[PDB]
Amino acid sequence: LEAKFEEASLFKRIIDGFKDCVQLVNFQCKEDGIIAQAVDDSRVLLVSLEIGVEAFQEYRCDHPVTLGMDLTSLSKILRCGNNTDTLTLIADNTPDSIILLFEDTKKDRIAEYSLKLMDIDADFLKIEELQYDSTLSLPSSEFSKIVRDLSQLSDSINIMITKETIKFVADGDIGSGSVIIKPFVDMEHPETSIKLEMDQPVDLTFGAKYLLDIIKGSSLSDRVGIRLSSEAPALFQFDLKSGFLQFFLAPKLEAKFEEASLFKRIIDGFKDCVQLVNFQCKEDGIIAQAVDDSRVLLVSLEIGVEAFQEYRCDHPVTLGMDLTSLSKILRCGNNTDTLTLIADNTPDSIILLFEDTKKDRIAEYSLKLMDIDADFLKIEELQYDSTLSLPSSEFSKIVRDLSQLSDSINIMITKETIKFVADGDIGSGSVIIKPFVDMEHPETSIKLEMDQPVDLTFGAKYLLDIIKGSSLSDRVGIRLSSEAPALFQFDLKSGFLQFFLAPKFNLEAKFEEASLFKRIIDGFKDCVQLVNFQCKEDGIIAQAVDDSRVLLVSLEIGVEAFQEYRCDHPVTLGMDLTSLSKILRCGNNTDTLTLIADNTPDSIILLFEDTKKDRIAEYSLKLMDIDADFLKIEELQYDSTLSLPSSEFSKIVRDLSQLSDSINIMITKETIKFVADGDIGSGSVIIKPFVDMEHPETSIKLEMDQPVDLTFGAKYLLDIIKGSSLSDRVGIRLSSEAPALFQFDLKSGFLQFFLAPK
DNA sequence: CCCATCGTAT
DNA sequence: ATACGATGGG
């Protein structure tokens, strides 16, 4: 047996389609192609795969062989090798195992993986039918969605077919939903058209669980054939060039929004901080008020009529809703669709009617209403000391960033100064924004209307619930009083979302691009948890050995890597990288990162600055005593030295790590061989040296004094490859009497990984 | 031109 | 399993 796909992606796309509902299947190979068939765990969902000869680039099957294998294992081997490589299945007349063989256009890379076959009882039932009461084909896209959606309402979906009508229906405890589509043919984009041939209407019901499995076949085809019958199992078929994948399954007040996205955005700001709320509807619009569990955060929404494309009310109605169930319905289908809220005189439930831009596509849902009491709420006239407004996206960042440090955030308002502060166990953090009016980008202006200084503390828990409404307005209004609740408002067109909140009672090294130091720390934060940052007049260096003592990480950042550098006195900054990460994530990758430390260091200062903005985010990490490591100065001669793209070396490692906990590197003349041999099967990657003038960063240099054959723990190599963010290339020095060297050369710096072979 | 969906990679 | 990128459709 020898069958090669032109594109390895194809075979991956096939396996992925049915790999989640079957653990073990048999592939019966014949002269006329490959075929497979299996059932799910419950044994009601039958899957059948047929791959004809014309589906391959080359197919040769000496003798009918049956290949039983575990899809989990196979799919792991299918993740390997670029999806543009030529995949080739090879099996002997009596196979102990099957051999997969990847090969790109060039001869540079050659991947050969082997999987161990199994003994399965396979009787391929080759059976389809001639007559289905109805037959239809729709984009597997639209279908996958329809199913994923109605699966939130019920455990059983229902398909109902009539002439020129396809109706999917679901009924559950929270509510019901029905999607009606009609047959149409698109001349310009046929891949979106809907075919329907009805010999006779059908009203079959199918378990949602199985449909959820079936829709995974969308990875093979842009379309999905469905054949229904009141006497036969339904046929869900995904066609592929010269073949197909089949799933056989046996049946069992009106307020209209121009954009549906608005209502979603509103509910999003509501949920997560409030459970259920009464939507009070009147002729002048809709209002809703809810408090959080602890009753310290009040949410006040007011939607004016002008916010609707069309709005009408005969009489005031109150709709009690569970925002969780509500958001489930709001999930689908399109954000741009026309949303409409219908309700009868004595509302037992509310009906949401989604309508696409296309006249054809329709979807309506019905949410069962709750019973909630409104009383009692009273808002005394509130006077505020300070009043500011700023880009919601900016305020959102500040909150999210500072939330990382403390469970409490402090807002301080002084004359022409707004200071956000958070103080936690690892260290503090303060962002200081300055009021300014900008003619260009006037939306990003920071207004301040202060009558008297204010110092208020809030639980980060609640500020994170407030920033949820940032999707409603470019800006956010903040009224702050010392005796009144803090008010956070998001302005809608003809409306608003308000949040009432109750207070609480409690060395100079400037990086050109902050992102640089961030990707550096990410390069070895997984290898070592605690590390000293020794700072000298010539730059920053760090040596660290993990607890296992097998890996040595050597960092070095030269002065030429900074936009500015000063060192009056050699300082050492012992830091917890896990802490340093949280802080490095806050500031922008483009912002200027300045490290500041006093002569007698107790803490380090990380300073994030903007280009033309007064905005300054200063952070502070608490240092800790880390005992330095014992340095071994080894000057030796390696057996072999190779350099390759760190992007390639990374893929190679991640691919083989799936097979074994050990990866063997074996250098021979003009050949580099990476081999992982695990239980499920052994995979092997073989690269060859070559130079490419046009693109030098794709070359592979290989100098060898003597063949090498070392094994490294995949656990460690997975950490070493994370330096691929620092350099396009990775240096590899290998020796039999010495630890391997993995080097990533930065600009005016480097990151060395000295790993010890097993 | 913008938005949504699907596929691929990490 | 999640995130990012690319392609297709509206």
Residue numbers in the entry: 2 to 253, 269 to 522, 536 to 787
Quote the paper:
The faithful and efficient copying of chromosomal DNA is performed by chromosomal replicases, which generate double-stranded DNA from primed, single-stranded DNA. These replicases achieve great speed and processivity by tethering to ring-shaped protein complexes called sliding clamps, which encircle DNA and have the ability to slide freely along the DNA strand. In E. coli, the sliding clamp is the β subunit of the pol III holoenzyme (β clamp), and the eukaryotic sliding clamp is called Proliferating Cell Nuclear Antigen (PCNA). The sliding clamps share a domain architecture that has a six-fold pseudosymmetric rotation axis running through the center of the clamp and a central pore lined with α-helices through which DNA is threaded. The central hole within the sliding clamp is lined with α-helices that present a number of conserved, positively charged residues, creating a surface that complements the negatively charged DNA backbone.
To overcome this problem, we generated a single-chain construct of PCNA in which three PCNA monomers are fused together by two 11-residue linkers (specified in Methods). In an attempt to crystallographically trap an open clamp, the single-chain PCNA contained mutations R110S and Y114S in the first subunit. The PCNA in the model is very well resolved and, despite these mutations, is closed and does not significantly deviate from wild-type PCNA. We used one of these datasets for the analysis presented here, derived from a crystal that incorporated a 10-base pair DNA construct with a four-base 5' overhang on one end. Based on this weak density, we placed a 10-base pair B-form DNA in the center of the PCNA ring at a tilt of ~40° with respect to the rotation axis of PCNA. This indicates that the DNA is partially disordered or has low occupancy, and the resolution of the dataset does not permit reliable refinement of individual atomic positions for the DNA. Inspection of the position of the partially disordered DNA in our model reveals potential interactions between DNA and the center of PCNA. The most extensive type of PCNA-DNA interaction occurs on DNA strand 1; a number of positively charged residues that reside on the helices lining the center of PCNA, especially Lys 13, Arg 14, Lys 146, and Arg 149 of subunit A and Lys 146 and Arg 149 of subunit C, create a surface that complements the negatively charged phosphate oxygens of bases 1 to 5 (see numbering, Figures 6A &6D). A second loop, which extends from the lower portion of the central pore of PCNA and presents the sidechains of Asn 83 and Asn 84 towards the DNA, makes contact with DNA strand 1 from two different subunits; from subunit A to the phosphate group of base 2, and from subunit B to the phosphate groups of bases 6 and 7.
